[PDB]
mmCIF file of C-alpha atoms and ligand atoms in Angstrom:
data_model
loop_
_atom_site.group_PDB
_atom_site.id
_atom_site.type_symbol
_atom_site.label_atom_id
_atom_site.label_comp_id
_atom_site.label_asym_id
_atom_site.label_seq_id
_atom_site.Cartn_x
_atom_site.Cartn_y
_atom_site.Cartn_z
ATOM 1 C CA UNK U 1 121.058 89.231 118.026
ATOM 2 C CA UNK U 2 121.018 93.039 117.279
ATOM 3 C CA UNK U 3 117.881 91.676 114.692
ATOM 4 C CA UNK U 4 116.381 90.317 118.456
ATOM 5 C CA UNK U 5 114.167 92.337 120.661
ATOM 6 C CA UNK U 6 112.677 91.491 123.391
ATOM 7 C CA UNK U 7 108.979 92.834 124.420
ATOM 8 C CA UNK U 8 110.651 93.040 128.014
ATOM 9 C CA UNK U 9 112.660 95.774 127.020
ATOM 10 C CA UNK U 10 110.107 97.631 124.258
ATOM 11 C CA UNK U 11 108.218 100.685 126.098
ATOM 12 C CA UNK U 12 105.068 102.229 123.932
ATOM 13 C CA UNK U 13 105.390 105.879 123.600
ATOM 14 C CA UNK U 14 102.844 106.476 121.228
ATOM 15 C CA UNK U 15 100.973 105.273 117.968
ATOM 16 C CA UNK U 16 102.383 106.262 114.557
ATOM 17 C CA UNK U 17 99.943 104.798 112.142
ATOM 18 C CA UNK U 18 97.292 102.775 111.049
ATOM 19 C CA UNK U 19 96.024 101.060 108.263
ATOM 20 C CA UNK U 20 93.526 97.968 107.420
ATOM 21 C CA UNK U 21 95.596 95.179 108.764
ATOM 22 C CA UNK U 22 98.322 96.596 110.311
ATOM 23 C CA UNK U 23 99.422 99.106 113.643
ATOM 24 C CA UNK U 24 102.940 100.740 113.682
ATOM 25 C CA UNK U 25 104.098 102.458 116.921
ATOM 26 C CA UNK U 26 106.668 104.304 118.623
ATOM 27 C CA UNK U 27 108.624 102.336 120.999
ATOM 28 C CA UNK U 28 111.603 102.906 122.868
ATOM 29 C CA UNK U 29 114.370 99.836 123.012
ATOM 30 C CA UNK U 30 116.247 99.945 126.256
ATOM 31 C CA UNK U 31 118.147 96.528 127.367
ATOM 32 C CA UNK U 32 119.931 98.520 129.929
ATOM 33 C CA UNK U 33 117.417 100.383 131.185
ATOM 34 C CA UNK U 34 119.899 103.374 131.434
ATOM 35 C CA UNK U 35 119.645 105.578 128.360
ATOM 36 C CA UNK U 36 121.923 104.318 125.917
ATOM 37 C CA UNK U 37 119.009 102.441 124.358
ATOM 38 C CA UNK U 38 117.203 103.743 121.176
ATOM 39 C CA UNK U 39 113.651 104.831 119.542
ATOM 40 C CA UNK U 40 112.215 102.073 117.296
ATOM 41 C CA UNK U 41 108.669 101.861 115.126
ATOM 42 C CA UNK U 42 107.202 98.613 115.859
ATOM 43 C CA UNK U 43 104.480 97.186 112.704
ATOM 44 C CA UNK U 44 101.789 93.933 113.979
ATOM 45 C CA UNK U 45 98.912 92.371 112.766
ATOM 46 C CA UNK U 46 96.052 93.442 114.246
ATOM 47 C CA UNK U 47 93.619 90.775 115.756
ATOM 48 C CA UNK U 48 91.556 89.010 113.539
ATOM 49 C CA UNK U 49 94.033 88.990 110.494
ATOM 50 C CA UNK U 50 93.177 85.844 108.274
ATOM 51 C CA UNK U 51 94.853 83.132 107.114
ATOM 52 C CA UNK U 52 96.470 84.786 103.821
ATOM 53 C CA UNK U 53 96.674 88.258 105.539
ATOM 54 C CA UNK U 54 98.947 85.961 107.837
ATOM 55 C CA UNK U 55 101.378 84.887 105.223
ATOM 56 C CA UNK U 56 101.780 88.189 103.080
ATOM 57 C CA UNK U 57 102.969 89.868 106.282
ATOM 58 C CA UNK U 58 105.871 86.777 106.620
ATOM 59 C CA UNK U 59 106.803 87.961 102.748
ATOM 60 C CA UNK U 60 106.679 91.796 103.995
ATOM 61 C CA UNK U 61 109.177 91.085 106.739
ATOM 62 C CA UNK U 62 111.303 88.766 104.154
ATOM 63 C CA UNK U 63 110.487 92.203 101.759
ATOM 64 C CA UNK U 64 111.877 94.628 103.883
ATOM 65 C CA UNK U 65 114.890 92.406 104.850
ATOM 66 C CA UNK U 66 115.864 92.232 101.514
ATOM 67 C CA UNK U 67 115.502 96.120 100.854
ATOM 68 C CA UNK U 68 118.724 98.305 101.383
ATOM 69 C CA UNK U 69 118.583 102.143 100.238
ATOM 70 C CA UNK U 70 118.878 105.467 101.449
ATOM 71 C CA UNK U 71 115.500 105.961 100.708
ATOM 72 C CA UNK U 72 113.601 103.171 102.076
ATOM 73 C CA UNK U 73 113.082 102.838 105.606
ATOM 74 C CA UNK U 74 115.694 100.541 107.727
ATOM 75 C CA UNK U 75 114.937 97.078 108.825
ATOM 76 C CA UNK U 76 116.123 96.647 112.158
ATOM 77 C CA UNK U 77 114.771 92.926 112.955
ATOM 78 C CA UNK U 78 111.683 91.502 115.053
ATOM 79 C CA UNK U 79 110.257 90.923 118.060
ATOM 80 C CA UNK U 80 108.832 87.439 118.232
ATOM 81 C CA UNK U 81 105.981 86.245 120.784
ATOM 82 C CA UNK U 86 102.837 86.054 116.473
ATOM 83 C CA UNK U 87 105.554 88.845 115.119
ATOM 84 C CA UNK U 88 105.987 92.094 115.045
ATOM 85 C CA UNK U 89 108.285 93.804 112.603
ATOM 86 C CA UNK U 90 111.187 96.788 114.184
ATOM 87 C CA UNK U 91 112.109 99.283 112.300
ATOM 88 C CA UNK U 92 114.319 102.709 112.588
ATOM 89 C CA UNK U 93 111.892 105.762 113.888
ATOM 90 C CA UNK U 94 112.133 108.286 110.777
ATOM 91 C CA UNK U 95 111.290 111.569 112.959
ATOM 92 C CA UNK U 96 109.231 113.810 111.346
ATOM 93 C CA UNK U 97 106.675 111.078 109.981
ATOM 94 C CA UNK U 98 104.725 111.253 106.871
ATOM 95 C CA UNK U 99 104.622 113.634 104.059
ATOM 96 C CA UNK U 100 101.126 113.428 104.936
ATOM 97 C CA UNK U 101 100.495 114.285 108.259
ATOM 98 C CA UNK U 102 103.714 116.798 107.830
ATOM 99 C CA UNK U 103 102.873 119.342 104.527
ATOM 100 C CA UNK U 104 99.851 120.992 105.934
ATOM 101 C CA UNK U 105 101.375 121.895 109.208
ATOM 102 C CA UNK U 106 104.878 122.814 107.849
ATOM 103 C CA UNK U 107 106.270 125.362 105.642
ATOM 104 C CA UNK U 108 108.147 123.321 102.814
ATOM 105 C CA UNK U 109 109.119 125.474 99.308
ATOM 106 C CA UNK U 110 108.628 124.341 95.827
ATOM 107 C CA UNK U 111 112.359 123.165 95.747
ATOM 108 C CA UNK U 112 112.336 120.936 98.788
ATOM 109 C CA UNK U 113 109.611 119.533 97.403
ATOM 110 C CA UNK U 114 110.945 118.180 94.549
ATOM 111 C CA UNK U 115 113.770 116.818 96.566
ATOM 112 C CA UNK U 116 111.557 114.605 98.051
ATOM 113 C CA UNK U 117 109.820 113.826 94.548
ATOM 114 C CA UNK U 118 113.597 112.778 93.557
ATOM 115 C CA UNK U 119 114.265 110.727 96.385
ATOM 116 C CA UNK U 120 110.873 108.925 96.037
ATOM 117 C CA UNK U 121 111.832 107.964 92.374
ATOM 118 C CA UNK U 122 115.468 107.010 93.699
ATOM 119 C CA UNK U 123 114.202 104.375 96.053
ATOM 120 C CA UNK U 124 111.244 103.194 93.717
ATOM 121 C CA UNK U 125 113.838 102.559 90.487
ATOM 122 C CA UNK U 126 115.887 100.173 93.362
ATOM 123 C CA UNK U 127 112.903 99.000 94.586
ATOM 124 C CA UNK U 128 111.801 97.999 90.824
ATOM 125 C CA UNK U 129 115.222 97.111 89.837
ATOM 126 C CA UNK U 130 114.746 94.323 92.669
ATOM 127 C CA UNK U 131 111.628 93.425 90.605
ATOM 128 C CA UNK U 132 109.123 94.216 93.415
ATOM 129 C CA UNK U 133 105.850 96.601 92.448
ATOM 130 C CA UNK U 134 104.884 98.687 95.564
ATOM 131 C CA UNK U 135 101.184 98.868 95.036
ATOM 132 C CA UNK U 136 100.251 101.871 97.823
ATOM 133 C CA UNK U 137 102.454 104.785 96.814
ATOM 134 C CA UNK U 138 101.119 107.687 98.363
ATOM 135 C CA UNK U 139 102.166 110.787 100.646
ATOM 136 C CA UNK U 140 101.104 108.510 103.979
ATOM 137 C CA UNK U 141 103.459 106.172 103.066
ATOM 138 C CA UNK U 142 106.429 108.584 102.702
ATOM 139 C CA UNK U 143 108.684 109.539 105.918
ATOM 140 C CA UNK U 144 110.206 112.228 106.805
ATOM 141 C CA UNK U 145 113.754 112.100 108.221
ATOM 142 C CA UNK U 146 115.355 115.587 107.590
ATOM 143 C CA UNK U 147 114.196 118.573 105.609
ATOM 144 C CA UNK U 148 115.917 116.933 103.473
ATOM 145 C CA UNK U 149 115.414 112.797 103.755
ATOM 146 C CA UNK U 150 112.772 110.881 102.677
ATOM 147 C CA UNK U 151 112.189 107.012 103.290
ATOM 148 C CA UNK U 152 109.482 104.936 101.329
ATOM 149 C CA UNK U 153 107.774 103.684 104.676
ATOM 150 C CA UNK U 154 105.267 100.666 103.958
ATOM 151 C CA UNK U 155 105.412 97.676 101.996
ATOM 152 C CA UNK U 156 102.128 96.255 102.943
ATOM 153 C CA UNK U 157 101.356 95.548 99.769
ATOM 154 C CA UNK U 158 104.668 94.939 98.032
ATOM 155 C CA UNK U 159 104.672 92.036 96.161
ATOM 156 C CA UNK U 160 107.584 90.215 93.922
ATOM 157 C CA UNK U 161 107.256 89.784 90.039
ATOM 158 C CA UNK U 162 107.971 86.430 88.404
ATOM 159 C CA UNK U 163 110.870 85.991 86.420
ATOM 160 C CA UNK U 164 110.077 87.472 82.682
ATOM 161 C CA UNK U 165 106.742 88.937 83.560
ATOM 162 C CA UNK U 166 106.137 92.865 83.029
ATOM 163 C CA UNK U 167 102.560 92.580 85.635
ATOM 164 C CA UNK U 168 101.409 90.805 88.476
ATOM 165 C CA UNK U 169 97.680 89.832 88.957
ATOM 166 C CA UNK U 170 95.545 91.341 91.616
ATOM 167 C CA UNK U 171 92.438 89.879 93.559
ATOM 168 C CA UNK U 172 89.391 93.134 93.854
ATOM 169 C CA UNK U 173 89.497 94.896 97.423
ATOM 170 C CA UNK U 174 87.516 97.087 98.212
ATOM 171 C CA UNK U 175 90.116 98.707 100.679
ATOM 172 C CA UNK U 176 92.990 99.622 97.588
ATOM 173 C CA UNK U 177 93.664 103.435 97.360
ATOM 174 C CA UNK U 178 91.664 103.257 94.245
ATOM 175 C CA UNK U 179 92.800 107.064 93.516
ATOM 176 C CA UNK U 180 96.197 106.317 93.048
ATOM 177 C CA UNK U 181 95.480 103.495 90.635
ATOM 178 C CA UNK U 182 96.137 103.336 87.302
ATOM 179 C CA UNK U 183 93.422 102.332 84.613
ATOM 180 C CA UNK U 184 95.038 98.918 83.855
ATOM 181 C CA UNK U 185 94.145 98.131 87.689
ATOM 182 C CA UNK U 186 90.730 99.379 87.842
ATOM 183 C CA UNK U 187 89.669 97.281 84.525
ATOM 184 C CA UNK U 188 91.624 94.868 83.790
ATOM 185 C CA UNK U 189 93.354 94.066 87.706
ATOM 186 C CA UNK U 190 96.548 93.932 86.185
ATOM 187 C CA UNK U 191 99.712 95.419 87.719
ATOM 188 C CA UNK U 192 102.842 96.794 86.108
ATOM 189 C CA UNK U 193 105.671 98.991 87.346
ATOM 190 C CA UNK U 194 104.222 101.485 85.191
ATOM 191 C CA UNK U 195 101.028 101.811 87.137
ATOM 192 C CA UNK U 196 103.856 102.208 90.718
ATOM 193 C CA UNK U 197 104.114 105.627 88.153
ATOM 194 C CA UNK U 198 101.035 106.681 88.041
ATOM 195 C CA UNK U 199 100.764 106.646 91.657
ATOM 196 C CA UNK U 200 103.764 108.249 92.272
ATOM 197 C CA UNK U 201 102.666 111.045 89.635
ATOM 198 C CA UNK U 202 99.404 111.476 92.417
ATOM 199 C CA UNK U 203 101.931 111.594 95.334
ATOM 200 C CA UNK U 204 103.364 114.318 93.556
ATOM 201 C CA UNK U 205 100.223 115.734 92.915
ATOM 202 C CA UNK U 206 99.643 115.463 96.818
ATOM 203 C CA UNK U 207 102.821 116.915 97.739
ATOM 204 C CA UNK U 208 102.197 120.287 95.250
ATOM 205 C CA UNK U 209 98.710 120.624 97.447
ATOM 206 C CA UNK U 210 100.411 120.479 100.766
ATOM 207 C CA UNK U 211 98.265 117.612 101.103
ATOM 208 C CA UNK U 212 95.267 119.443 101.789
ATOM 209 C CA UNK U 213 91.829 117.429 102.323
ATOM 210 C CA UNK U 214 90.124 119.962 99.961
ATOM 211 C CA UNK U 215 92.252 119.576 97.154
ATOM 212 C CA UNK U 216 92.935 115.695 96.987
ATOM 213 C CA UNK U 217 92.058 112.964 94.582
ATOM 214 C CA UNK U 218 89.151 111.682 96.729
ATOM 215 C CA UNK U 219 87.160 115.059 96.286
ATOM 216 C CA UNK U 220 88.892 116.575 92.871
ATOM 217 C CA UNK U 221 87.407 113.240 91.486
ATOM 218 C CA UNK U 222 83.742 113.682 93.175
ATOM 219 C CA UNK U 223 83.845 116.900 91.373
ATOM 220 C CA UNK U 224 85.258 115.457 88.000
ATOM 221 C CA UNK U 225 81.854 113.049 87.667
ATOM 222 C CA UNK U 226 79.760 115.732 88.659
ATOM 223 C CA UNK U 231 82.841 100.230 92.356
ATOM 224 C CA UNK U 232 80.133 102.362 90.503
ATOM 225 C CA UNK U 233 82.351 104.707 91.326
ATOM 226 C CA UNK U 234 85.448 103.144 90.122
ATOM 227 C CA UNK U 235 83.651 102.205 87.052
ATOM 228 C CA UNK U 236 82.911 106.074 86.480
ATOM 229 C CA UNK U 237 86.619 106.811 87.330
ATOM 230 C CA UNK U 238 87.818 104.290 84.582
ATOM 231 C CA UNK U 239 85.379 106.078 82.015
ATOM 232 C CA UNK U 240 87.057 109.694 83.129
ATOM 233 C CA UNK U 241 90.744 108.239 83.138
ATOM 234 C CA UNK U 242 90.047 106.799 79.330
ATOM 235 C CA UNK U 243 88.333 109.959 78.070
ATOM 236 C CA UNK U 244 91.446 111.338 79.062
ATOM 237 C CA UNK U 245 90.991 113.913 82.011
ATOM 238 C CA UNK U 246 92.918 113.685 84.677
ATOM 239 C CA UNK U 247 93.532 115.833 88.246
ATOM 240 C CA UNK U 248 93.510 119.717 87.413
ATOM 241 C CA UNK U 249 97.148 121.381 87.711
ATOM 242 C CA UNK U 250 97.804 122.753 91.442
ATOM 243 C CA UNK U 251 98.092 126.878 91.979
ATOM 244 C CA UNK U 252 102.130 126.405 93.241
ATOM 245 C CA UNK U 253 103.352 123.382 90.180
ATOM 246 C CA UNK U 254 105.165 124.899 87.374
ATOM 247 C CA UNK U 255 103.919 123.892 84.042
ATOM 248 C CA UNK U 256 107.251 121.562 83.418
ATOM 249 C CA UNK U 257 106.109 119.531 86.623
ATOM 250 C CA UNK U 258 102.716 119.070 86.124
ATOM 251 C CA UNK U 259 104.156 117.837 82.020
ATOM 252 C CA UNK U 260 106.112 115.556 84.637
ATOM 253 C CA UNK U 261 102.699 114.313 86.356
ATOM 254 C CA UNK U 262 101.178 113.955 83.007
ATOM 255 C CA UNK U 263 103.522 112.087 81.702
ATOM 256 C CA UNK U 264 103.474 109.672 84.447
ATOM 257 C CA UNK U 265 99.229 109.329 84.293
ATOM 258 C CA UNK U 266 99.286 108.270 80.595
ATOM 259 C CA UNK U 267 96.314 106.601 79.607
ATOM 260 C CA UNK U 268 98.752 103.491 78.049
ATOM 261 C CA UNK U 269 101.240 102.094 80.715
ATOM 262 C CA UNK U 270 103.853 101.655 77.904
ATOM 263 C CA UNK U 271 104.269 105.519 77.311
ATOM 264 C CA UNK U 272 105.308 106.542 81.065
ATOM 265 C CA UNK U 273 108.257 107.072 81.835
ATOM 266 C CA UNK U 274 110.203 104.913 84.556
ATOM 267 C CA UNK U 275 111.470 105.493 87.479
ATOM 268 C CA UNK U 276 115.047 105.806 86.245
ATOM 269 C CA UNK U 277 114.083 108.553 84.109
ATOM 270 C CA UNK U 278 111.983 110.439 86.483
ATOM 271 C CA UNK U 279 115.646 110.590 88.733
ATOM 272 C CA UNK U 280 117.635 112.837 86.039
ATOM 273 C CA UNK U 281 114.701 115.261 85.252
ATOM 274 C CA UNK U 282 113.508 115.480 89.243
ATOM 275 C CA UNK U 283 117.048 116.366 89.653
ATOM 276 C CA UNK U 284 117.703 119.792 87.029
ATOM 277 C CA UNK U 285 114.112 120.536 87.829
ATOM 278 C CA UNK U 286 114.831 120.762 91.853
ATOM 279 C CA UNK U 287 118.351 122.407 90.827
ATOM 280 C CA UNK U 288 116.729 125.281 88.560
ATOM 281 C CA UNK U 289 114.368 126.113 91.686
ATOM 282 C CA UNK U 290 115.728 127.932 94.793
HETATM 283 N N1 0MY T 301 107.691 107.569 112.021
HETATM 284 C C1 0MY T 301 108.161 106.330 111.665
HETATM 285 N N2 0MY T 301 109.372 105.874 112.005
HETATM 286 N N3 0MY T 301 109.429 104.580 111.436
HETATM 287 C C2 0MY T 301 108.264 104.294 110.782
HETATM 288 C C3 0MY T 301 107.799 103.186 110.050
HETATM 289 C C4 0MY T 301 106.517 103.222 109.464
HETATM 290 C C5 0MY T 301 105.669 104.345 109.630
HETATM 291 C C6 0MY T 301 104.334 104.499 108.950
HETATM 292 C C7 0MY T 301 104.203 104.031 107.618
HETATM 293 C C8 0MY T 301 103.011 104.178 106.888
HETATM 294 C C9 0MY T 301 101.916 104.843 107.463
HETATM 295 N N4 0MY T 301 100.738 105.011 106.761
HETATM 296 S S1 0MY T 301 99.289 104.358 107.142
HETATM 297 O O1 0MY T 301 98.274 104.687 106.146
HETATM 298 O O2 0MY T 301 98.872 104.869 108.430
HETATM 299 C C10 0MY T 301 99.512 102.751 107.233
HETATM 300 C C11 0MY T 301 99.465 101.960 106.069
HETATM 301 C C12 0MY T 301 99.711 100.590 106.131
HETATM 302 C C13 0MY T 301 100.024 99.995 107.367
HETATM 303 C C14 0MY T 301 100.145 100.777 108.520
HETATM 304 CL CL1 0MY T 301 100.480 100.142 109.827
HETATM 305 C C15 0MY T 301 99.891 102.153 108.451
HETATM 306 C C16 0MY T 301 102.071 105.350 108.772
HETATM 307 C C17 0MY T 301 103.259 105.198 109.511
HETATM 308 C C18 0MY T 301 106.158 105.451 110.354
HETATM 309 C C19 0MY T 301 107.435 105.403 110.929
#
């Protein structure tokens, strides 16, 4: 029942994002039609979604059921016609479109960073790799709450196994990706770390077009391209330290990109470190 919503009482009020398969939009849930109703995001398929496109989005609403943190955005149930998956409305939006029109200090930052690690050590403690951590998918609640947003492509791991096995796309954020995805298509938690160590690397840039991966990476060479990014990630160079990160942090961020998935730390450690490190700035 409260996990039931009717299309009769959902009103668009505008679009909140879009990605390769899916639409999420603001709607507004009134059953009354008085004003005691309440703002929702609503996530569907767009048209032409195949057959196994069709079936990973069942196991992202079963996904997101099964997900209960502070930090991770709220199931709130479906709307059923085809389905469409309701969510809470996190106000301020994404860490991405938010940052370069907002004034957000070094310390708030790393608040976010914190929370991010929080909800991605429960989110890998439920033995679930996230696969497209990045500042788009991070909401903003509060100056001071952030909720993992998507789980697109969130995907379980098998009872003893440390990776899960990816099929090439050519529509993966390949700069976020570790080099154990780009060669050898295998994911670990460990390579959820590297990405989160280039969402903190977005978040120290304000996310600024100028200064992301994307173009600090066109720069760095000077598929073919993710075969030239592989070579660059092995040799050992990685994104350049941002004017604004303290040396500790960007230790942090290089800690998190090492070359050998084995040697970064997890999320659980990233927690008590985040922590002193947003505590010691004010
Ligand atoms: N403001 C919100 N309240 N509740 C939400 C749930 C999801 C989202 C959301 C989450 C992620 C994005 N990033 S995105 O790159 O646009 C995207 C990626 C994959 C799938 C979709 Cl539909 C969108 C954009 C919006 C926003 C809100």
């Amino acid at each position: 029942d409260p996990t039931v919503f009717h299309k009769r009482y959902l009103k668009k009020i505008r679009d909140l994002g879009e990605g390769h398969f899916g639409k999420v939009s603001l709607y507004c849930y009134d059953p009354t039609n008085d004003g005691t109703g309440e703002m929702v995001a609503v996530k569907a398929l767009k048209e032409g979604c195949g057959p196994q496109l069709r079936s990973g989005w069942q196991r992202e609403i079963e996904i997101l059921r099964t997900l209960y943190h502070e930090h991770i955005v709220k199931y709130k149930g479906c709307c059923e016609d085809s389905v469409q998956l309701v969510m809470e409305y996190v106000p301020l939006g994404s860490l991405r479109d938010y940052l370069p029109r907002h004034c957000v200090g070094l310390a708030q930052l790393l608040l976010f960073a914190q929370q991010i690690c929080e909800g991605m050590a429960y989110l890998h403690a439920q033995h679930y790799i996230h696969r497209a951590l990045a500042a788009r998918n991070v909401l903003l609640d509060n100056d001071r709450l952030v909720k993992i947003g998507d789980f697109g492509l969130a995907k379980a791991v098998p009872e003893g196994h440390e990776y899960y096995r990816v099929r090439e796309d050519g529509d993966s954020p390949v700069f976020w990706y570790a080099p154990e995805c780009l060669k050898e298509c295998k994911f670990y938690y460990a390579s959820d770390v590297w990405s989160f160590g280039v969402t903190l690397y977005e978040l120290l840039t304000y996310c600024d077009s100028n200064q992301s991966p994307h173009t600090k990476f066109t720069e760095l060479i000077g598929q073919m391209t993710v075969l030239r990014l592989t070579e660059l990630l092995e040799r050992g160079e990685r994104l350049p330290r941002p004017d604004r990160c303290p040396c500790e942090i960007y230790h942090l961020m290089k800690n998190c990109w090492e070359t050998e998935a084995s040697f970064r730390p997890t999320f659980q450690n990233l927690v008590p470190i985040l922590q002193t490190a947003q505590e010691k700035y004010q």
